[PDB]
Amino acid sequence: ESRELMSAANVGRTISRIAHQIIEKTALDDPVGPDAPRVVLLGIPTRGVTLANRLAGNITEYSGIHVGHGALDITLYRDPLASTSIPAGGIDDALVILVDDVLYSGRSVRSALDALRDVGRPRAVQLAVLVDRGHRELPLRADYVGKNVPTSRSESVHVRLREHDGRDGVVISR
Amino acid sequence: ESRELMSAANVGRTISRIAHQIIEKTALDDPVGPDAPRVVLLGIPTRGVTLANRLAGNITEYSGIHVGHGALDITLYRDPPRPLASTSIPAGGIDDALVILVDDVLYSGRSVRSALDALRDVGRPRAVQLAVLVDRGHRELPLRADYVGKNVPTSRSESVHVRLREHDGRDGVVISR
Amino acid sequence: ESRELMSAANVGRTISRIAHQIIEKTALDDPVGPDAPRVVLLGIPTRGVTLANRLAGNITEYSGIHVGHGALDITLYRDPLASTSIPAGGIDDALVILVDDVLYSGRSVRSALDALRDVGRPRAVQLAVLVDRGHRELPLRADYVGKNVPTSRSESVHVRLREHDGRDGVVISR
Amino acid sequence: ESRELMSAANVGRTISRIAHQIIEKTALDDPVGPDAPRVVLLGIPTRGVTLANRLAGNITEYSGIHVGHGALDITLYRDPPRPLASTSIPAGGIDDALVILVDDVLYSGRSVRSALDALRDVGRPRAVQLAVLVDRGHRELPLRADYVGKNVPTSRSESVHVRLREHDGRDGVVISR
Structure with missing residues (x-):
């Protein structure tokens, strides 16, 4: 049994809202200096990558600015995916935003x-x-969150994005 | 003296971001549910109203749709003899609406x-x-905002000065001791 | 259909934890002065009153101190209960903690x-x-919270306390 | 110079409060569910360990029960040649346990x-x-604490000095510029 958490329209709005939050918290509207870091978005494959692309693309059209984006393959770091792709310049002294x-x-x-x-x-x-x-299971938290969804362990949450799934949205299932 | 908390650039982006948040939390981007309350913004005079107007108009620039908005004077309810600004309720009133107070x-x-x-x-x-x-x-009361531009730790001896372009001529926030 | 959120033992622990938080946030371990306020707990009938009593009682045994407590009847302020009972001294310049x-x-x-x-x-x-x-429905929030419980509108949450209900606990129902 | 953030009184009460919170979130006051993980506290040397010991013992003063606790040295993992404190894992290890790191x-x-x-x-x-x-x-990393004594806004030029009685002789927290 399915049930939808976020419509296509919700997903797109939520992404643009997140891009705004990133611009704010990472000072991309401000001039530049030791406390304006270079920002790079790295997605975790598969859908994390697409999200990083959608974010980098929203940022650019909202602020006119081209933030580096790429992919971070975690296949070898886990306890047919996109391979790792790091933008030119690398990530030394950057503010990396991991996207999942x-x-x-x-x-x-x-x-x-x-x-x-x-x-x-x-x-x-x-x-x-x-x-x-x-x-x-680890003391981790997201700086930017689209939706907080209370769940039980028996529920599965699925994020659908156009490129992979045909339509945007999020569904909960059992 | 004084330091800049928010530049003009920071103000417009943050207002845009709150407009986005309002759209999400109240569902303006979707076709409106069976018992969804209409959304009305009511500014607290004078800068609250300036902010409400900007939000209403960012919401329409961003999502094309038109929310009721207005002004709720609170002069007589705070703490002289009379109301210093006008209360303006959009047509259709606020009965069974979702009102967002803006300050x-x-x-x-x-x-x-x-x-x-x-x-x-x-x-x-x-x-x-x-x-x-x-x-x-x-x-001093168990109140919190649903939407916040910036959370700013302050001392009781500091003051926060918000300037919004239509009421003050520039956008900005400064803090003074 | 029922299901329990908090056991008797959970409720009692949660209350003592809340008393500790109150002591901390209201400076009851500190000497006294213009930023150590007199504290008064007022419960909203019915179970809110009992909670205020349980809290005032935990505070006292944890810190040795007697905080004023009472009841605030809201019958006439609503849009066979306890009547209003305000401790001696009243609430002028006090820090009132409303309890529900x-x-x-x-x-x-x-x-x-x-x-x-x-x-x-x-x-x-x-x-x-x-x-x-x-x-x-109003821009209100609790300073002290025992449990945050995600719910749907069709669910009802019921708090049971010994004095009224025979055993402590909290149950969700549909 | 320096001001007191937390008095000795404030420290003991806050440690007691965290012990209460640990009991709740990990379920020590109830009879232990079918697949509940055992709880182990591991302090980061040296004051992290002092704190972990105090928590373990407040948890037992308050709820009578005994949690595994110890020390996890991180010398070699931060940033000389060697570990400056001892790692001490309680009997039974940490495999499939709920470990609470304490600092x-x-x-x-x-x-x-x-x-x-x-x-x-x-x-x-x-x-x-x-x-x-x-x-x-x-x-600088997407990390947060499950349990926090006090959240303290600071500037990068301030320092926070925690003193715990078994390691330092008094309980207290001060902040210095």
Whole structure:
């Protein structure tokens, strides 16, 4: 049994809202200096990558600015995906925003942290996620959250994005 | 003296962001549910109203749709003899509406509690939410904003000055001792 | 169909935890001065009163100190209960902690605020509740919360306390 | 110079309060569910351990029950050649346990991230939570504490000094510029 949490229209609005929050918290409207960091979005495959693309694309059209974005494959860091793609310049002294679709256990994000340190040494790392569905197993939290969804362990939350799934949305299932 | 908390750039982006949040939480981007309450913004005079107008218009720039908005004077409800600004309720009233009260700064919460009194003299909303630009802490009542531009730790000896372009000529926030 | 959210033992622990939080936030371990307020707990009948009693009683045994407690009848302020009982000294310049069992709409708390101002003029008002079950209709929030419980509108949350119900606990129903 | 953030009185009460919170969130007051993980506290040396010991013992003073507790040295995992304190894992290990990492102050989060690395070299917990006395903001990693004594806005030029009686002779917290 299915039930929809977020419509296509909700997903798109939520993403633009998140882009605004990123612009605010990372000072992208401000001039630049030691406390305006270079920002890079890295998605966790598969849907995390697409979200990072949608965010980088919203940011650009809202602020005119091109933030680096890419993908961080965590296959080798886990306890047919996109391979790792790091923008030109790398991530040394950058503010990396890790992007994922759903924050559940937090284990995927911990894996991303590990994979990141093989890439280089960011000044800071933040986390943006479309859904936070509780049940953390690690002391992790998202800086930017589309929707907080209370769930039971027997429920599954599924994020659908156009590119992979044909339509945007989020559904809960049992 | 004084330091800039928010630049003009920071103000417009934050107002845009709150408009986005209002759309989400009250469901303007979707076709309107069976018993969804209409949304009405009521500013607290004078800068609350300036903010409400900007939000209404960002909401329409961003999502094309038109929310009722207006002004709720609270002069007589706070703390001379008379109301210093006009109360303006959009057509259709606020009965069974979702009213969002809008102010520049959330401090003690006493202004919002006044506005709850004033609203009750206008009508009977289904629900009341609160949007502010700055929440500066130091609540004296169990009130909080639904929407907040910036949360700003302050000392009781600091002051927060919000400027909005249509009322003040520039956008900005500064804090002074 | 029923299901239990909090056992008797959970309820009692949660109450003592709340008493500790009150001691901390209201400076009852500190000497006294213009920023150590006199504290008074007022319960909203029926179960809110009993909770205020249980809290005042936990505070006393934890810190040795006797905080004023009473009841605030909101019958005349609503949109066979306990009548209003205000401790000696009243509430002028006090820190009043309103106590209720469940925070739902917030309308009961708004009614309490109104009833309070007929009693006198506190320096500040806080709110302590055993359960917050979402679905606010007013911009109100509890300073102290036992359990946050996500609910649907069709669910009912019931707080049971020994004195009224025979055993402590909280149950969700449909 | 320096001002008192927390008196000795404030420290003991706050530690007691966190012990209460740990009991709730991990379910020590109830008869233990079918697949409830056992709870183990691991302090980060040296004051983290002092705090963990106090929590373990408040938890037993308050609820009579005994949680595993110990020390996780992170010397080699942060940032010389060697470990400056001892790692001490209680009998039964941490495999499929609920480990609560305990430290005095949560700042950047880099110490906690080190401790996650160190924990992984000890075993495979089912879950890891974090308790700290003071969270002073300025996170550089997406980490947060499950349990916090006090949230303290700070500037990067301020320092927070936690003193706990068994390690330092008095209980207290001060902040200095």
